[PDB]
Amino acid sequence: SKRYFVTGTDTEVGKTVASCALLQAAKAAGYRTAGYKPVASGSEKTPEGLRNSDALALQRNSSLQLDYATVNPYTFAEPTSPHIISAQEGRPIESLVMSAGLRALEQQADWVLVEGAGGWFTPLSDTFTFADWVTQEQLPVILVVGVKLGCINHAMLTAQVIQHAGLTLAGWVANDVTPPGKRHAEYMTTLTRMIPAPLLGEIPWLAAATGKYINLALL
Amino acid sequence: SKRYFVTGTDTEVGKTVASCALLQAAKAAGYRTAGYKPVASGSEKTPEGLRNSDALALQRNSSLQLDYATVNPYTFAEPTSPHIISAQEGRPIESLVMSAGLRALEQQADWVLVEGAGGWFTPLSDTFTFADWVTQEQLPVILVVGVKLGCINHAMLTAQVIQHAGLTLAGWVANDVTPPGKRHAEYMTTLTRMIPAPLLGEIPWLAAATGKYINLALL
């Protein structure tokens, strides 16, 4: 299976918007697809248990019909860092369960997209971050950049840290998080020049069918 | 002179609030102090030229009376990345002028605080970032962290990149950018454990006399 990890420059950069656009393009290219969000915090109660909305978006954008717990093994109600609510609830986030879940998807999908929680360095326990699991699984990384003031600095910090860990930065996606503003073209040029990986596409500001904005031929 | 560079985890983390608190504490400890903001964008017109409000805060919190242009050599009206408006206006941001200005302050002050524009990797030209000048001047760095969701990731990215450049992370300051919330203590504990430098103090949420929240004995 092709496998990719999607991370964002900041919270609220629209990372799941770009993940669904990636999933839609892969399905159009003929892949049997699966989204995976091993850890999620900020979930709703339903008759069947807690359901996180980003995870639900990945489930309905996968081309395989998949059960919710296959898409998202660890679901926490409170929208805070996973290591805080894991400790609070007495439910350890185990690396082996996170890896077993990815293997289970690879039985049935040949293009798997893995979305983390938060940014690169989100703690999962007091001695373990999301970055440690991604390095361990040796996943190529796709960076989602919300285009706004301050994103050049965040895109550059994240890009140097992934490369320092010896991982491949497979590409980046620009997500227009605000209406058109004055320095949009100059920001897109600086980001293109400075991020050492291909721009896969730009999703316009929309307050669903977004696969067309992604060029999967560059991945 | 002692010299420090202040950088923030994101835009609007209240970096100049922490710079003025640092300047107030140094003055209380008996230093002849000077703030320096070599580059600023987002300035007002006055009868004497453009004036940037952060720069004005540094000027009035310095214990020496200083002229505005000594505090802030490069002033741009538009609030965007310095390399965009520098190119637009046809006024190159020169490293030698930025360094000459720091030396000029060192003639008269023995404790100089240097504040950048934006975050670590703010471009000053197409081939030169703020990070390049700070590495060149070999300044110790103080990190200002706004405590909010998403700051663990940003504080960790910035801390690893400064250390990778071989610079000293002298310490960090926690700035409470929102009213008290649910996971404030747990966030302060995770940030203390993960940032490899002493916590110098925490400034409470206030929508001016803040020197008391800084322990200068740890610098």
Ligand SMILES: C[C@H](N)[C@@H](CCCCCC(=O)O)NC(=O)O
């Ligand atoms: C306008 C902002 N306040 C700041 C410049 C921000 C540059 C951000 C660059 C980026 O996107 O990383 N200017 C200044 O502090 O003087």
Ligand SMILES: C[C@H](N)[C@@H](CCCCCC(=O)O)NC(=O)O
């Ligand atoms: C609640 C957020 N949306 C996210 C967790 C953010 C963790 C941020 C940690 C930090 O401060 O760096 N959860 C999630 O995506 O499932």
